[PDB]
């Protein structure tokens, strides 16, 4: 679920998902167009694609379980959708961690009109 993803994001990064990642660039928290602004935004682009891979799942609301094994996220077995949603979220949270070094606040609240063009998953 979105709340679980937000908790994972905070755990990884130390940033609150709202506001740090909910309106960032072209693809985070919202959006389907544009060239991603930076690596963090590309995490979001890929995450959006990952959810798009799951048209008969409900990633915003369906809950999954995960644990940590020496820091590492391990998604525990639930339904098929839950497992796949968890793997999408895990990847994005790791990606955000891997790209903190370039996170930029100037991309929070990024205006929609600066995001144009489709980029295929």
């Amino acid at each position: 679920s979105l709340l679980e993803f937000g908790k994972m994001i905070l755990e990884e990064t130390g940033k609150l998902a709202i506001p740090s990642y909910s309106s960032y660039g072209c693809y985070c928290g919202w959006g389907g167009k544009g060239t991603p602004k930076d690596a963090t935004d590309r995490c979001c682009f890929v995450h959006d694609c990952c959810y798009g891979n799951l048209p008969d799942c409900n990633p915003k609301s369906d809950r999954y379980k995960y644990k940590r094994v020496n820091g590492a996220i391990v998604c525990e077995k639930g339904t098929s959708c839950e497992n796949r949603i968890c793997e999408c979220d895990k990847a994005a949270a790791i990606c955000f961690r891997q790209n903190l070094n370039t996170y930029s606040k100037k991309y929070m609240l990024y205006p929609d009109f600066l995001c144009k063009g489709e980029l295929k998953c």
Partner: peptide, 4 residues
């Protein structure tokens, strides 16, 4: 929360 985000959207995605």
């Amino acid at each position: 929360i985000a959207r995605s």
